[PDB]
Design a protein around this ligand. Structure first.
Ligand SMILES: Cc1ccc(C(=O)NC2CC2)cc1-c1cc2cnc(NC3CCOCC3)nc2n(C)c1=O
Length: 344
């Protein structure tokens, strides 16, 4: 049966949630809505509750609401944010207007852990291993993050990590919103594959190893120059693959530079970490190491377990190429809310 709801004002909005969720407290923004910490009295867990802001105001909003819910309902992995609950105060489809999403509450994000300082090699091993384990799973479902960064890697006290905000994607200037992006998507070179996320992992791993942003560009061009100084200018082979004639033409105009020595860039770092970095930070996305391949790298020998790195069940995203009206997206969303079954 339907739980009893109570009303409360939180982020200049009235949150209506089941009684089981108590002591709601703002913890900031999430993707397409604000997030509150809460105590789930039924499970004894601290949870994160995101209220989607105007989930059905446009076709774009309605489709993205459906998109997020489908993603959350599918993902069942230790290193990937999962859905504990989804609710609406609405008693019917015609009343249906608000969507709330409930996940585990994590203690911090990876930015909070970095704090201008280096981390130990074993801690870097454990953190990056978990990211790649989570990415292997996500990528196996043909889902791409596209915007992986320290702020969407959530970690608890004992360094257990979950990936947030995948499958959904202010890019101007000296900002962490662009520092982790693969150049092929930063400058719209081509149709981009899953290893855009592996570029991001490389950027994050370097930062955990040095305590410093790898490519802190002040803008798109400055960031590209920082990147190419490290990995070298593209060869003829990659140039052909740049389907954007405009992007390719600009690239060829640049003075050619050789790849730098990563051992001279990351002094004192584990030679295996350096090796893995060289395989992640490859300009040609076709040649970049994959998550599955990275997990088998010698750098993760003490964590790697081929029988404990699962892939996802088939994920039907045929809806992505479907044109529908707001009410049609809204009804599909409602069906998904109603049919939800909580995890064990
Ligand atoms: C509530 C929720 C629902 C959906 C998704 C999501 O990832 N959707 C795309 C489709 C996959 C993410 C969340 C989510 C969880 C969350 C958990 N803990 C914490 N803890 C915070 C403490 C303070 O430090 C930063 C982390 N912040 C969080 N945030 C911000 C969130 O957005």
């Amino acid at each position: 049966e339907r739980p009893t709801f109570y009303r409360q004002e939180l982020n200049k909005t009235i949150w209506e949630v089941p009684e089981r969720y108590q002591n709601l407290s703002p913890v900031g923004s999430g993707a397409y809505g604000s997030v509150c910490a809460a105590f789930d009295t039924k499970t004894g867990l601290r949870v994160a509750v995101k209220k989607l802001s105007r989930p059905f105001q446009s076709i774009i909003h309605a489709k993205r609401t459906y998109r997020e819910l489908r993603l959350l309902k599918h993902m069942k992995h230790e290193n990937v944010i999962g859905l504990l609950d989804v609710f609406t105060p609405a008693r019917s489809l015609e009343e249906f207007n608000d969507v709330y999403l409930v996940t585990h509450l994590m203690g911090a994000d990876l930015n909070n852990i970095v704090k201008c300082q280096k981390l130990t090699d074993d801690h870097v091993q454990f953190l990056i291993y978990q990211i790649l384990r989570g990415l292997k799973y996500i990528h196996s479902a043909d889902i791409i993050h596209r915007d992986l960064k320290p702020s969407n890697l959530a970690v608890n006290e004992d360094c257990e990590l979950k990936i947030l905000d995948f499958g959904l994607a202010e890019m101007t200037g000296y900002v962490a919103t662009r520092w982790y992006r693969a150049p092929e998507i930063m400058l719209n070179w081509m149709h981009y594959n899953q290893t855009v996320d592996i570029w991001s992992v490389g950027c994050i791993m370097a930062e955990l190893l040095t305590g410093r942003t790898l490519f802190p560009g002040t803008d798109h061009i400055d960031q590209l120059k920082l990147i190419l100084r490290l990995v070298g200018t593209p060869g003829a082979e990659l140039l052909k693959k740049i389907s954007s004639e405009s992007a390719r033409n600009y690239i060829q105009s640049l003075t050619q530079m050789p790849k730098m020595n990563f051992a001279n860039v990351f002094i004192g770092a584990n030679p295996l970490a350096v090796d893995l970095l060289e395989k992640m930070l490859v300009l040609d996305s076709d040649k970049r190491i994959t998550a599955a391949q990275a997990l088998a790298h010698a750098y993760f020998a003490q964590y790697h377990d081929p029988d404990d790195e699962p892939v996802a069940d088939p994920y039907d995203q045929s809806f992505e190429s479907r044109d529908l009206l707001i009410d049609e997206w809204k009804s599909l969303t409602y069906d998904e809310v109603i049919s939800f079954v909580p995890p064990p």
